[PDB]
């Protein structure tokens, strides 16, 4: 009953957040076993940001130049190394609150929860989608770098995002936990254009299925379409093409609700061509594309962790 | 940079969630010190729901009739008592993860985070507002009763909501943790009309201030209004009257942005009378009223817990 943008419970990730200070810069790190993972630009100065030689800057630094605090406890650094755009700080204490975890590189269209942190301390949690242009629309202030994004599956935390930078228009960019950026961005203060974003078609369809499950049906029309004729309209409206793999992924939702995927497409096609005409869908006046099919099923069947 | 509906980190509340079983019914409870708090209708049968004598039903029950599980650990019940619509189960073990906490009865217009739980296990977290008609728009399935809503202030969890029931239209109702319902509802399966809801004016104004802080200014007009002429338009549009206490509460936001509260009102008045004309505000096509002034300041100044 009801449908909300829902984040994963954040307690397993809260117990892993730490503060990392090198010189004047303080940001957040992720403490798993005896390793702290943080963005490498913590070793930069204000004037290094425009073109840092990260490898050279790291030469200057010794283990003791890294202050790592977990709450009020200082963690002794005993090894440091770079992996892509992330720093790995080996510490002499293993995090006793380490959950079962994996590092995963997510694909565009997938969603995850963000635990926004400042000074090693969690501020809030919200749900984000990795946009087709490899950005995310989050809420991050100065000092938020090192905040992570994650999914939970029973007991396993799958970390998929670490925050590195913000751009004009509330656009945020980051890396996986192996340090590789999503999309063509660098941890450098230079002109960096995010590509044009598009709407995640399969997530819109998922959210329409969620509307029917929850009672909204005014938009269900009397038509059907082929896959090809739908992707002609999607491209005109800056929607991702719908692939057969997407059709298969909506399968279980189609079976629950009795609406074949291509009938939902016909209903979507008319929403894009005529608009909503003042009406709302699940309390929204815009088509929502930040729910995956799996997000819908979770919320609607009550999957716990 | 960016603005999102943001929940509090839920880890302090996760460590308090337990499963309570009496007979066939299982729901969630909140374990603080040596006490478990849960909705009293856990002692009901399917046919008792229409008109339960809760006091009489509780006579039948003994301490051992209550199964309380925290994860895989069974907690021994050693005392039971009713307080309004909540049950208090004294247990022989004190929750070692009890945070600093208070029980608070919130006022309409205030927001809080909900930790939706099933079988004592957290499923997700999201942010809700207590509507003027004393309902909330959440996402709750069968088995969600006992899930709680809360705010966090530095280290203190202020519990303000416990979930008891759902009504047609994704409308949800519950109690404070002293067991008293918000609004005129009873824990009975009978016809129960929620009053007409209205829009929380002061939260809309807060969210407009958040838009200006974040860069959206197209809606700022060249006009001002008095308090009285604004409340004439608000009432026509099902908006709560704006009180001087609300004007004072928006004070700090007005000072940050340089927009006097009554100028924002003039800008709001024109949005209500002409609509948005296809435009969006902070990525929304509807005026949003589930951010308090304090929610805006938190998100925009980076308050941590
Ligand atoms: C890390 O705390 C910080 C997070 C930012 C502040 C956030 O989410 N809101 C501010 N990251 C940060 O400042 C980046 C620095 C490391 C990558 C080197 N830089 C930026 O985020 C940044 C650079 C630019 C820019 O360069 C030109 C133009 C416009 C905006 C911008 N933002
Ligand atoms: C507790 O798990 C459960 C939560 C519900 C199911 C939820 O959030 N989605 C289902 N609470 C529950 O079922 C309530 C029982 C205790 C108060 C006695 N009852 C209802 O929620 C309820 C009663 C009615 C009704 O009576 C007439 C008409 C329409 C809807 C309704 N819902």
Residue numbers in the entry:
A (entry chain A), B (entry chain A): 1 to 305
Give the original sentences from the paper that presented this experimental model.
Nirmatrelvir (antiviral component in Paxlovid) binds covalently to the active site cysteine of the main protease of SARS-CoV-2 (Mpro), thereby blocking enzyme activity and halting viral replication. In vitro passage experiments mimicking a multi-dosage nirmatrelvir treatment regime, identified Mpro variants with mutations in the active site and near the C-terminal dimerization interface with variable levels of nirmatrelvir resistance. One such variant harbors a triple mutation in Mpro, L50F/E166A/L167F, that displays decreased potency for nirmatrelvir (IC50 ∼ 850–1600 nM) and ibuzatrelvir while viral replication remained similar to that of the wildtype (WT) virus.
To confirm our hypothesis, we performed co-crystallization of the triple mutant with compound 4. The resulting structure complex was solved to 1.9 Å in the P21212 space group. Here, we see the P3 4-methoxy indole fits in the S3/S4 position of the Mpro active site where it is stabilized by hydrogen bond coordination with the backbone amide of A166. Upon further observation, the E166A mutation alters the packing of the Mpro dimer. Additionally, with a small, non-polar methyl group in place of a polar carboxylate group, surface charge of the S1 pocket is lost and becomes more hydrophobic. The L50F mutation is also located adjacent to the active site, forming the entrance of the substrate binding groove. The phenylalanine causes widening of the S2 pocket, as previously observed in the single mutation, causing a shift towards a more open conformation. A co-crystal structure highlights a flat, extended aromatic P3 group, the lack of bifurcation towards S3, and a small cyclopropyl alanine P2 group as beneficial structural features to ensure tight and universal binding.
